[PDB]
Amino acid sequence: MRECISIHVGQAGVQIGNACWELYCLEHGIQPDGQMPSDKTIGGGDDSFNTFFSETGAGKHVPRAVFVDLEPTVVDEVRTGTYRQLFHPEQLITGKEDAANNYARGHYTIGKEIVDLVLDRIRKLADLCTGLQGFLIFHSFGGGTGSGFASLLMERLSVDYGKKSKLEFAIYPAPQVSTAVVEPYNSILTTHTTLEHSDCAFMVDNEAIYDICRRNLDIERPTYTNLNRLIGQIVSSITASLRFDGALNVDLTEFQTNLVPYPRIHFPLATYAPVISAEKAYHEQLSVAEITNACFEPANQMVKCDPRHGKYMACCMLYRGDVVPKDVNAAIATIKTKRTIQFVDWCPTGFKVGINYQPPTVVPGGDLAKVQRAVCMLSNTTAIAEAWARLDHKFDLMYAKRAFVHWYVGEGMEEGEFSEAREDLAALEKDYEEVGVDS
Amino acid sequence: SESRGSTAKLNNFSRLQPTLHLLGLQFDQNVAQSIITEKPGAATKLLYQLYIALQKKKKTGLTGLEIQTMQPQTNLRLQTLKSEAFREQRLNRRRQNEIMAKIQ
Amino acid sequence: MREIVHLQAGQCGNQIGAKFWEVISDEHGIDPTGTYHGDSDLQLERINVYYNEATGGKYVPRAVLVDLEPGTMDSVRSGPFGQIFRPDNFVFGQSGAGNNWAKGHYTEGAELVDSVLDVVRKEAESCDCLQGFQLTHSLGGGTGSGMGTLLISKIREEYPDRIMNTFSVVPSPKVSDTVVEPYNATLSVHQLVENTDETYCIDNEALYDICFRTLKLTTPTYGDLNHLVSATMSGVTTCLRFPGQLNADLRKLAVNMVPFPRLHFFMPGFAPLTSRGSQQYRALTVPELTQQMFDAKNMMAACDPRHGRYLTVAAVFRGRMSMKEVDEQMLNVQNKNSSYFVEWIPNNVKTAVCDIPPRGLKMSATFIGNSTAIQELFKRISEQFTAMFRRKAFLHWYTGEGMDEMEFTEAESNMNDLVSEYQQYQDATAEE
């Protein structure tokens, strides 16, 4: 049935996968041992866990995910954890040499060495599953492991399965803050691969996460754990109608078909809400109209872009928790008449209604409080094109006299790829501009 | 359409009403009642009002289309035309019944 | 004997069908187990229309559930009456429709269609003689609209001498569930006007507005709309289910209120739609029912019939009142409201009273008519289709399936012809 396989490449991908798995096990009552030792007091677990987990003959659960990394330090860090008894060591492939924010090595001289093993692993995992719809590839554009290895693996998975959905989840180099320097070098080469060889791509950064956490959660000392929790909540909200049911189930295909207006424009704008802390979730009346209106506020977006600069192509609304249809209808009636929100003269309306009976849960030790209902937004607008424009400007300004390029030359790769990626991104920006222009 | 069949008269009056109201004259329910029942005086009175208003148009200055600068008219008259059609139906609630008797 | 085979398509179609089955089981006195628990008289003779006789008096339903997603059958089976149906009729695929009509018709409409044709053929051969086939679905997705038209075409090709009545859900620009919804409505309307006897317009926004401004419900949900459509269906079908003095049947209704086969759309509507606190202060009489069936407030339309002229009107009553009141009421309405119906054709209202009152309610009566109000929906659908087809947005998905774009061109030509026909028949003048 509705079963999917998750792919985790790089340190960020591995940590995101761990956060997702721990969230799933805590929300489904799955104990870290892998069995059900709860023989005295039950606390749930009688549901459809086959979507992500598997049931053995002895009452054991096996996670279905791919944990690959070129550097063994992350593998060892996860291995020495308290959840080591859950997964299998064969799912965690170590490596001698790593990329560490380098594309040429991890695409030619490092990633090409471990290919057959991961292919056999994913073939075994697919054979272990009956129904397959899409994949959950977790990587990063800054990390060389999540850029070179991810590109070479997805180029083969695309030619091995043309009928299966190919998703994407990674991190965008923020214009203001950054971690490394050669991040756009890997980004300019990864974007072409993700555009001309994938169906959809989700783009997020960390600066907006920092802004929203300091503005709502009001933390002076953030940490990666909160970011991972937010990402896992987003992923769970997106894939909510798969593990469970509701009034109107929304599968991966159901929203993916409409979320792609054109083969070249497949970069939606996610928006999770409410992103609030404990004290921010008690003295505050929560309805649907307010949170839906807040979803279109630029301050709550995880991409730094003003929606008012462009206009929307396609909108996809999702909901999770006790939601009443009349509230959704009233919110739709309100937003459709809002003059602030812009749109084209050709799409008066389009959206989805995903009602999920199971409300979002909480975690002991986390920052998210107990909210009766949740909402997730995936919209398509041209105002986000500035990020690619800024990235192209950076690539042009640092490619003028070839800063930090001689290494890529010595490793072995064509210099013409830089110009090819540049012209492809220029054409993509031109297409975005043309689509944004109305009559 | 001049035909004695009152559908032709409906066609005529549907266009006559806004023209009656480009002057602001009251196209009146009892006026149409006397039109169909042929009570002398009402339609004649409105026609004479229109006649002397034509004389007013020819008296000093602007044509009726240029007269619109005096007092803004078509601010609610857009709704008035539709209400005129609906009130022509309402006049049908009493007047067209005899015509429909032969057609039913 | 004379039995009606019921069909299911689309998740919304499945839920409304389950609601209708539960409603009729409760009305006719059927326990959730499967036996009989009624206490009436006409609930044993003509009970075989929707049921089948088996050992121990355990009647079985007659409805085939067609779907592409296995998640709907689990949802509908866990209900209080989900254990009584035939699991063999639950023919579900493995891949969802993805709100695609072309993909659902081509990929998921080739290797799965054989089973449903086989089972419906078996059901048809099981009985002696039949009248028609009822299919309840929605145009919002590739499940209802994707295979409902194909199944209707197949059954018309196999058995041309049957009734094809459906209750598909029309879309609305104000309340949308699919981005490519006008594409799917476009594709479905062609099959509806080419290979379908009759069709009834179903809207959710109008029902929501009705239950908000008149019923005044606290938390209106899909269950309320399912109950309302089930009640409307029961009131429509009581003409044959419970015979009375002036009984009617589906085929007579279809012949009498369809002036032209190209125009077979209708306007359904119930009447006693009152709030909870008003139920104990009401006057059960004829003029009130006539007023609630004539005004545009109680109709389930996201439109206004006052913009056009009434073409065909049928008032189906269900109770024990009289005969003279209905005719005098319609006479004085036609006398007064003369500019609301076609003048060239008198007596556009059909009289029909069911002597058997429904269970739980004494006075019930539905309103089935074809007024001139769907024209704006048709023109707005045509406008939105032209707008999105100009630059060909969201078209690569359909192109990759294999079907070309000429289908859209011929479809839009067909709607242009149909709307031209509708507006030039709207102003049906007597003579030159």
From Swiss-Prot, chain A:
Its EC number is 3.6.5.-. The modification N6-acetyllysine is found at K40. Some glutamate residues at the C-terminus are polyglycylated, resulting in polyglycine chains on the gamma-carboxyl group. Glycylation is mainly limited to tubulin incorporated into axonemes (cilia and flagella) whereas glutamylation is prevalent in neuronal cells, centrioles, axonemes, and the mitotic spindle. Both modifications can coexist on the same protein on adjacent residues, and lowering polyglycylation levels increases polyglutamylation, and reciprocally. Cilia and flagella glycylation is required for their stability and maintenance. Flagella glycylation controls sperm motility. The active site is at E254. Pfam families: Tubulin, Tubulin_C. The modification 3'-nitrotyrosine is found at Y83. The keyword Cytoplasm applies. Alpha-3 and alpha-7 are identical but coded by two different genes, they are testis-specific. GO terms for molecular function: GTP binding; hydrolase activity; metal ion binding; structural constituent of cytoskeleton. A motif (MREC motif) lies at residues 1-4. The keyword Magnesium applies. InterPro entries: Alpha_tubulin, Tub_FtsZ_C, Tubulin, Tubulin/FtsZ-like_C, Tubulin/FtsZ_2-layer-sand-dom, Tubulin/FtsZ_GTPase_sf, Tubulin_C, Tubulin_CS. SUPFAM superfamilies: Tubulin C-terminal domain-like, Tubulin nucleotide-binding domain-like. Its cofactor is Mg(2+). The modification Phosphotyrosine is found at Y432. Mg(2+) binds at E71. PANTHER family: TUBULIN. Tubulin is the major constituent of microtubules, a cylinder consisting of laterally associated linear protofilaments composed of alpha- and beta-tubulin heterodimers. Microtubules grow by the addition of GTP-tubulin dimers to the microtubule end, where a stabilizing cap forms. Below the cap, tubulin dimers are in GDP-bound state, owing to GTPase activity of alpha-tubulin. This is Tubulin alpha-3 chain. It comes from Mus musculus. The gene is Tuba3a.
Curated annotation (Swiss-Prot), chain B:
This is Sperm flagellar protein 2. It is found in: Cell projection, Cilium, Flagellum; Cytoplasm; Cytoplasm, Cytoskeleton; Golgi apparatus. Disruption phenotype: Lethality occurs at approximately 3 weeks of age, accompanied by severe hydrocephaly. Weight at birth is similar to wild type but subsequently there is significant growth retardation. Bone mineralization is reduced in the vertebral column and hindlimbs, associated with decreased bone strength. Bone length and skull thickness is also slightly reduced. Trabecular bone density is reduced, along with reduced trabecular number and increased open porosity. Expression of the osteoblast marker genes RUNX2, BGLAP/OCN and COL1A1/COL1 is reduced in bone tissue. Interacts (via C-terminus) with IFT20. Interacts with DYNC1I2. Required for correct axoneme development in spermatozoa. Important for normal development of the manchette and sperm head morphology. Essential for male fertility. Plays a role in localization of the intraflagellar transport protein IFT20 to the manchette, suggesting function as an adapter for dynein-mediated protein transport during spermatogenesis. Also plays a role in bone growth where it seems to be required for normal osteoblast differentiation. It comes from Mus musculus (Mouse). Highly expressed in testis, where it primarily localizes to late spermatocytes, round spermatids and elongating spermatids (at protein level). Found in Sertoli cells of the testis (at protein level). Expressed at lower levels in epididymis (at protein level). Detected in lung, brain, liver and kidney. Also detected in bone, cartilage, trachea, pituitary gland and eye. Expressed in osteoblasts and chondrocytes.
Swiss-Prot record, chain C:
One of its GO terms (cellular component) is myelin sheath. Some glutamate residues at the C-terminus are polyglycylated, resulting in polyglycine chains on the gamma-carboxyl group. Glycylation is mainly limited to tubulin incorporated into axonemes (cilia and flagella) whereas glutamylation is prevalent in neuronal cells, centrioles, axonemes, and the mitotic spindle. Both modifications can coexist on the same protein on adjacent residues, and lowering polyglycylation levels increases polyglutamylation, and reciprocally. Cilia and flagella glycylation is required for their stability and maintenance. Flagella glycylation controls sperm motility. It is found in: Cytoplasm, Cytoskeleton; Cytoplasm, Cytoskeleton, Flagellum axoneme. A motif (MREI motif) lies at residues 1-4. Its main location: cytoplasm. The modification N6-acetyllysine is found at K58. Its cofactor is Mg(2+). Mg(2+) binds at E69. GTP binds at Q11, E69, S138, G142, T143, G144, N204, N226. Signal peptide: none annotated. One of its GO terms (biological process) is flagellated sperm motility. The keyword Magnesium applies. One of its GO terms (molecular function) is double-stranded RNA binding. Belongs to the tubulin family. Tubulin is the major constituent of microtubules, a cylinder consisting of laterally associated linear protofilaments composed of alpha- and beta-tubulin heterodimers. Microtubules grow by the addition of GTP-tubulin dimers to the microtubule end, where a stabilizing cap forms. Below the cap, tubulin dimers are in GDP-bound state, owing to GTPase activity of alpha-tubulin. The highly acidic C-terminal region may bind cations such as calcium. PANTHER family: TUBULIN. This is Tubulin beta-4B chain. It comes from Mus musculus (Mouse).
